[PDB]
């Protein structure tokens, strides 16, 4: 399995953490210089034509990190808990994966990408949207050990790829007491968290 | 099964079309006046505390339309094709459902909701984002009868809930020749399309 990634992006780290949680080996490919001038057509035809991350699983090309994550869990997961077969529990993981993409990750990107990439002026309205997403996440975690069920699921891995990035960028999570509790307990439980997530956080920190 | 809905919203119509495609009966509940003054606490406790649409399936509460859709397909679908059990085909439906939410539906909402709701000034940048999403959809449909596989899937039902709304709002789809082809062939195939989708479109048209 080939894994086309940019080590910094939360979606890439979400997929990497999922593979680590499932004990799946992947051949990591870095697509940094893929948009550089004069890359051979033969190099550009292997370049994923859509978004990063992308996997190539014996010719099966799949982009969209959260679709990759649920594919990997079912195709290669030895047991249930990461993405339960039970339809109600699965629906809640799915629900939380959509929340992660449209509230948490979107708010993270909307605020930090103008700053980090374009060196632009901080948007105070966009900054508060992060807090709004975290307040929802904090409510999901009220009285709960995990974001989307009684065990760690894919939704924990996807959400932690962004929450860990917020903390690396010095966003204070303390007021979100359930998010802070969850983030502290989840890191030691995530297989190879340091290797596959904290490594990529360095560019931000 | 209770179905809390606003008949106009594309996500509600997506769920309604899914139930119709699966021959599932639901008890439709209208949450229009749910934010009106002086609704009894007993009425507000039955009100869904999160987003519309929401289902209540014998006490199982589920919001997020696309999570509802995949739950309904697996829990109540007699056969495979709408949401295939095959993991590669399922991954592509899932992928297209995320695209539908973050490109197609988001671009629709970003342009029309300021106008329709707030009577605001048209945003020319937001208008072009619809075209950008449709160009991607048109590329997915190149050489294809359906948006996410060889048969009609949930991704067709979710995408059509927004595309049909664009056409009701006089967005011209003709330049997207594959989107126009697909929309014309998909409407007669969708069980109860008129009853459950065109009815709700009237407020926009």
- CATH code 1.20.1050.10 region(s) in chain A: 87-201
- Token pair 């679908």 is found at B77
Q: What's phi and psi for B159, nearest 5 deg? A: -65, -40
C-beta separation of A81 from A153 below 8 A: yes
CA nearest A159: which of A66, A23, A64? A66
Q: How many residues does chain B have?
A: 205
From the CB of residue A47, how many other CB atoms can be counted at a distance below 10 Å? 14
**Which residue shows structure tokens 């490594």?**
A199
The DSSP letter of residue A78 is S
Give the bridge partners for B56, in sequence order: B2, B61
Q: By C-alpha distance, which of A69, A86, A64, A85 is closest to A22?
A: A69
First and final C-alpha spacing in chain B: 30
Helix residue ranges per DSSP H, B141-204: 154-168, 177-186, 193, 199-201
Element (H, E) at A33: none
> Kind and range of the H or E element at A145?
none
Alpha-carbon gap: B187 to the closest alpha carbon of chain A (Å): 27
Q: Cα dist. B205→A150, B100, B144 in Å?
A: 45, 22, 29
Give yes or no for A71 touching B (CB within 8 A).
yes
Q: Which residues is B27 bridged to in the sheet? A: B2
The catalytic site residues of A sit at 9
Experimental method reported for this structure? X-ray
Catalytic residue among B9, B107, B158, B164: B9
Q: Is A158 exposed, middle or buried (0-12, 13-18, 19+ CB in 10 A)?
A: buried
Q: Is B60 on the interface with A (CB under 8 A)?
A: yes
Assigned token pair, B182: 């697909």
| Residue B60 with chain A: CB contacts under 8 Å | 88
Q: Give the bridge partners for B205, in sequence order.
A: none
Tally of helices (H runs) and strands (E runs) in chain A: 10, 4
The CATH classification number of A87-201 equals 1.20.1050.10
- B62: distance to nearest CA of chain A, Å? 8
Two structure tokens written together for A181:
């509790």
Domain A2-76: homologous superfamily in CATH: Glutaredoxin (3.40.30.10)
Instruction: Give the sheet arrangement for strand B54-57, strand by strand.
Output: B27-30, B2-5, B54-57, B60-63
Task: Name the DSSP letter for residue A35.
Answer: G
What six digits make up the tokens of B18? 């899914």
> Which is nearest to A200 in space by CA: A168, A153, A157, A156?
A168
User: What angle is formed at CA A92 by the lines to CA A90 and CA A96, rounded to 5 degrees?
Assistant: 120
Instruction: Specify which residues B126 forms β-bridges with.
Output: none
Give the three-class secondary structure for A56: strand
Structure tokens at B23: 């021959």
Name residues 112-171 of chain B within 8 A of A (Cβ): none
- Sequence ranges of chain B with CATH classification 3.40.30.10: 2-76
Helix, strand and coil in chain B, % to nearest 5? 60, 10, 35
Q: Is residue B7 within 8 Å of residue B30, measured between CB atoms?
A: yes
**In this structure, are residues A131 and A151 in contact, taking their beta carbons and an 8 Å threshold?**
no
Sequence-ordered alpha helix ranges (H) in B39-175: 41-46, 65-76, 87-99, 106-116, 124-140, 154-168
**Distance between CA A171 and CA A150 in Å, rounded?**
27
Collapsing DSSP to helix, strand or coil, A62 comes out as strand
Q: What is the DSSP string of B65-92?
A: HHHHHHHHHHHH-SSSTTS-SSHHHHHH
């Amino acid at each position: 399995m080939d894994f086309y990634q940019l080590p910094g992006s939360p979606p890439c780290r979400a997929v990497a953490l999922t593979a680590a949680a499932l004990d799946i080996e992947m051949n990591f490919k870095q697509v940094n210089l893929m948009n550089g001038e004069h890359l051979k057509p033969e190099f550009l035809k292997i370049n994923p034509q859509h978004t990063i991350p992308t996997i190539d699983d014996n010719g099966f090309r799949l982009w969209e990190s959260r679709a990759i994550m649920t594919y990997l869990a079912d195709q290669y997961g030895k047991n249930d808990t990461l993405y339960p077969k039970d339809l109600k529990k699965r629906a809640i993981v799915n629900q939380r994966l959509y929340f992660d993409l449209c509230s948490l990750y979107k708010s993270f990107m909307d605020y930090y990408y103008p700053i980090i990439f374009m060196k632009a002026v901080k948007d105070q309205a966009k900054y508060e949207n992060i807090g709004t997403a975290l307040s929802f996440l904090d409510k999901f975690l009220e009285g709960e050990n995990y974001v989307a069920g009684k065990n760690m699921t894919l939704a924990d891995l996807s959400i932690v790829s962004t929450v860990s990035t917020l903390e690396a960028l010095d966003y204070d999570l303390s007021k979100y007491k359930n998010v802070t509790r969850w983030f502290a307990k989840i890191k030691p439980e995530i297989p190879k968290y340091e290797e596959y997530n904290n490594a990529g956080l360095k560019m931000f920190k």
